[PDB]
Structure formats: C-alpha cells, structure tokens
Design a protein around this ligand. Structure first.
Ligand SMILES: Nc1nc2c(ncn2[C@@H]2O[C@H](COP(=O)(O)OP(=O)(O)OP(=O)(O)O)[C@@H](O)[C@H]2O)c(=O)[nH]1
Ligand SMILES: [Mg+2]
Lengths: 10, 142, 180, 200
C-alpha cells in the first residue's frame, strides 16, 4: 500500500 | 512568493494543486507533468532543489506522496522547506495521522487549510496554533 | 485503588505550591521574602548563601527560596533549580547600572531547559522613589513580552510599603494552581 | 520598497523600530507559538533579515544601524536545524547585499565556507547559491573556495553540479582564465548532455 502511512510519522 | 504548490504521489497521481500564477489550462497541465517527471526522475541525494525555468523547484516528500514548490530566486532555499514542514505539521494536527487515503477524501479540507495558511504564494499565518484555531472555527460554522 | 483520602484532603485544602527568590543584589528579594514570611521591613546582612522560608496564603504554602545577587552566590542558584516549580526574578528599577546585569541574570536563568515549568515572576522592587519605572517600561526593557512559553507578569512591589506583594502572590498562585 | 524607490527614504525611517523588534525576537529564544526546531518566529526573522538586506543597501546609516543586529544574529543563532541554517544564509545574504563592515563580510564568508563543506545537498546548494550571489562582492575572498568549486562540478547532484559550474564561470578572472580553461574543457568533454551546451 504505502498510502495509509503517516506523512511525518508523529 | 510561491508560484505554485502541488502535492503529487510517487506513482505520479496529484493529490493537491495550488498555483498562484494565472496560466493556461494546457500550459498548467504541461508544467505539472514536467514537474512530476523531474521529481519522479530525481534521486534522493539531489538536495531536493531544482532550478527549473528559473524557479526554485523544491521537492521534499516525507512519505509516498511528495510535495513540490515553485518560488522566485529572491529568498533563501531553507525558508521554503521550513514553510512546507510547517504546513505539513499543521495539516497533520488538523486531521490526525494524515495519510494518502485521507488526503484524497479531505481534498476540500486540505484546500481550505492551504487557503487559510498561505494566500497568493506568501506566508499568511506565522503561528501554528492560531491558524489551526481559525480553521476549526471556520469548520464549526457549518 | 481508592482516592477517598485524596478527596478528603482536597476538600479542606491540600495544595501547597512552590516559589523561587532570585534577582540582583539590593533588589529587595530578601526584603520581599521577609515581607511574605513575616511582614515587616527588617534590615539584614547581604545573603552570602541563600534564604529558605515558606509563606502560607489561600490555603497554599508557597515556599520561597531567596537567592542573593552576589557574584559568588549568582552561580549557586542552579543548586535550587533542582526540584523547583517556580522562579521569581527581583528587578532593581532604581539601579540603572545594575539593570543590565539583572536582565542578563534573568535571561541566563530562563535560558535553561531545567527551568522551563516555572513561569516568569518579575517584581518591580524599589518602588518608593520617583526614579522607579512603571509596570510596562520595566517589562519592555527586560523583554518579558517576547518570552514565549513562559507566564511572566510585571508587578510593582515596594519593600518599605508592602503594596503589590499580594498581587504578585495571587499571580503566582494563578500561574501554578489553575483550580477553583 | 521593491516596487518603487520613492518609499525607500520613507520606509528607511523605521529601521530602528525593525532593529528593536528583531532584537526583542532574538532575545526570546523559545516560542510556544511559531517556534519550531528551537527557532521562534523563523518566518518573522527571515522577513526582518530580508528587510534589513533590502533596506539601506546603498546607504551607510541603514547598514550601520542594522550592523549590530546582523552581528548578534550571526553569532547568536544556531544552524543545527534547517530553520537556523536558513536564517544564517539569509543574514549572510543581507550582509553581502548591504554596505556592511569588514568583520561582517569576513563572518559571512566564513559561514559560507563552513556551509560549503556540509554534506547536506540542500546546504551545499545554499552555499553555492550564496557564493554565486557574492561573486562580484568579496570576489577576492571567493577565490579561496576554488577547490570546492572545482569539486562541486564532479558532485553527484544535478543542482549542486550546476551551482558549481555557475560559480566557476562567475569566478573566472583575467589571471585564472588560462588555468581554468583546461578545467572548463575537461568539464565540457565529460559533462552531462544538458550541461555540455551550457558549458560550451
Ligand atoms: N530602604 C528601602 N530599601 C529598598 C526598598 N526597595 C528595595 N530596597 C532594597 O532592598 C534591600 C534589602 O536587602 P536584603 O534584605 O539583603 O535583600 P536583597 O535586596 O535581595 O539583598 P541581598 O539579600 O544581599 O541579595 C536594600 O538593600 C534596598 O537596596 C525600599 O523601598 N526602601
Ligand atoms: Mg536576600
């Protein structure tokens, strides 16, 4: 996928 | 000021688009395609800065979807990166765990946040909490 | 677990709070601490080390640790910075030459990551002569309005008169305690 | 001020107010609001630096009034984060574009040289852009980075390589032209297809 991941991971 | 800011995914799909310069629709599409090709055809050690068409084409994506900005050669390069990071942080705070799927569904909200943050390519809200509070108040109006 | 004992203690008052006594020498910090603890203008020798005292007001025992403004005692304020929840800066509006030194000391004290939860507490000491500035000129000179993430308030307190100490204590209590 | 120069004199009277505002902002190194990466009001600081660089660019009073602020910012700012590096670059650009003191120019040159050795691609690009902008100004001091400019041509960054080539072209003088001719020919022979025409 790779779309559900957070943009900044915070 | 920022001539145009567009959010494009890794596969080439564009999740956001905001140009502060009036250009033809065909010309705008060609410029967006060229920017996507340059970003898609650039490595991770290119400094995230491209001087395309005499514009500071700065590409810096923290996830699969990347972000691009076009500013004139009259300000520092790090300022654009700082503004992009601040906008990303504000969007994440407004949404909460912002992902690629949420960006497509929240296109109107993202456009409203971008309009309330930067207007005409220039910075309009230096603070990060005031802009969020204003966006929340506008959303709560109905 | 049960919190019945905590509720019973809080029903009649259990909060105490803390405070700090720092500033330049001859700035009324020792006099301010004596007025808070005792309430009289008593002449004392310069604080070579530090003064420890507690004041009970509004059911809260706000202990203030007075620190001298001496050169040999200025660097000793870091010892009291450990396990400290408040910080009070003593300004000398009547000492123009020492105003810069007091401002530098306040900036150095506030420029430490350890002293971050303690809000700014600036008291306009020496408020008995016409040369004393107002509550806005001192803050503007010290740049307290630009200290973000710090609850700093400018209050004018005269050691000889004692007026303004209650306002400063109330401001400190409001900054520390945010309950009804 | 940038649109017309008639308001430069009228807008130059507020230089002390801007200097005082910048000093007050620098005094508070933390910011609950707008303070990111340890820099409080980075946008405000950048705007102040840009105004100082564009204000009094051909006057001595304006440069002298903001000389102390520029000196304080050049030494009271940490470039560990991106905001600090951008602020330092903006201050260096303002000092170079204004009639600053010799010490300010030396400090700006030292900052540019230090940023040139940084391994970050963005930092290297910023240093190359600053060197290219400060080509005519402090040209003698820019000659100390000839080795860095030559090495930037072989860098694996398209933007970095372009900046290095531009700096080398702008740094060609009447004495290093003969020496730099061989380097330019070698770069053109072994250059990218998009840079061969530009190199020629
Ligand atoms: N007489 C008088 N003295 C004042 C007044 N306001 C402030 N002061 C100062 O308060 C000082 C009292 O001295 P201390 O009790 O030792 O307290 P301090 O000012 O912190 O001095 P140190 O303890 O040595 O740091 C005097 O030396 C005065 O300079 C005032 O209204 N009248
Ligand atoms: Mg004392």
């Amino acid at each position: 996928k790779g779309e559900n991941t957070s943009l900044l991971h915070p | 000021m920022i001539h145009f800011i567009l959010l494009f995914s890794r596969q080439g799909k564009l999740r956001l688009q905001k140009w502060y310069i009036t250009l033809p629709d065909k010309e705008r599409k060609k410029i967006t395609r060229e920017i996507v090709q340059i970003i898609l055809s650039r490595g991770h050690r290119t400094s995230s800065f491209v001087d395309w068409k005499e514009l500071k084409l700065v590409y810096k994506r923290y996830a699969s979807l990347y972000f691009c900005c076009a500013i004139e050669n009259q300000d520092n390069e790090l300022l654009t990166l700082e503004i992009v990071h601040r906008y990303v942080e504000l969007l994440d705070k407004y949404f909460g765990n912002v992902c690629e799927l949420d960006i497509i569904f929240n296109f109107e909200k993202a456009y409203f946040i971008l309009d309330e943050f930067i207007i005409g390519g220039e910075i309009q809200e230096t603070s990060k909490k005031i802009a969020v509070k204003a966006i929340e108040d506008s959303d709560m109006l109905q | 677990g049960n919190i019945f004992a905590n509720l019973f203690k809080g029903l009649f008052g259990k909060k105490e709070m803390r405070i700090l006594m720092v500033g330049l020498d001859a700035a009324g910090k020792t006099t301010i601490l004596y007025k808070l603890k005792l309430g009289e203008i008593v002449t004392t020798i310069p604080t070579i080390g530090f003064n420890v005292e507690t004041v009970e007001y509004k059911n809260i025992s706000f202990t203030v640790w007075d620190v001298g403004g001496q050169d040999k005692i200025r660097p000793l304020w870091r010892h009291y910075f450990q396990n400290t929840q408040g910080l009070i800066f003593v300004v000398d509006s009547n000492d123009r030459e020492r105003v810069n030194e007091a401002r530098e000391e306040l900036m150095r004290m506030l420029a430490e990551d350890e002293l971050r939860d303690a809000v700014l507490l600036v008291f306009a000491n020496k408020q008995d002569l016409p040369n004393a500035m107002n509550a806005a000129e001192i803050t503007d000179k010290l740049g307290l309005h630009s200290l973000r993430h710090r609850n700093w308030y400018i209050q004018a307190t005269c050691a000889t008169s004692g007026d303004g100490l209650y306002e400063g204590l109330d401001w400190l209590s409001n900054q520390l305690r945010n309950q009804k | 001020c940038e649109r017309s120069p008639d308001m430069l004199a009228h807008f130059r009277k507020l230089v002390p107010q801007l200097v005082r505002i910048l000093k007050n902002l620098i005094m508070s190194g933390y910011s609950p609001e707008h303070d990111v990466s340890g820099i409080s009001d980075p946008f405000l600081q950048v705007r102040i630096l840009r105004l100082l660089r564009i204000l009094g660019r051909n006057d001595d009073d304006s440069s002298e009034a903001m000389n102390d602020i520029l000196a304080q910012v050049a030494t009271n700012t940490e470039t560990s984060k991106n905001v600090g590096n951008a602020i330092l670059y903006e201050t260096v650009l303002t000092i170079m574009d204004i009639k600053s003191e010799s010490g300010l120019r030396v400090l700006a040159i030292n900052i540019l040289g230090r940023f040139l050795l940084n391994n970050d691609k963005n930092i290297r690009y910023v240093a190359l852009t600053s060197l290219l902008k400060t080509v005519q100004t402090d040209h003698n001091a820019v000659q100390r980075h000839r080795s860095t400019i030559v090495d930037c041509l072989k860098d694996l960054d398209v933007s970095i390589k372009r900046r290095a080539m531009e700096l080398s072209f702008a740094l060609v003088n009447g004495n290093n032209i003969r020496g730099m001719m061989k380097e330019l020919l070698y770069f053109l022979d072994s250059c990218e297809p998009e840079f061969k025409a530009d190199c020629a």
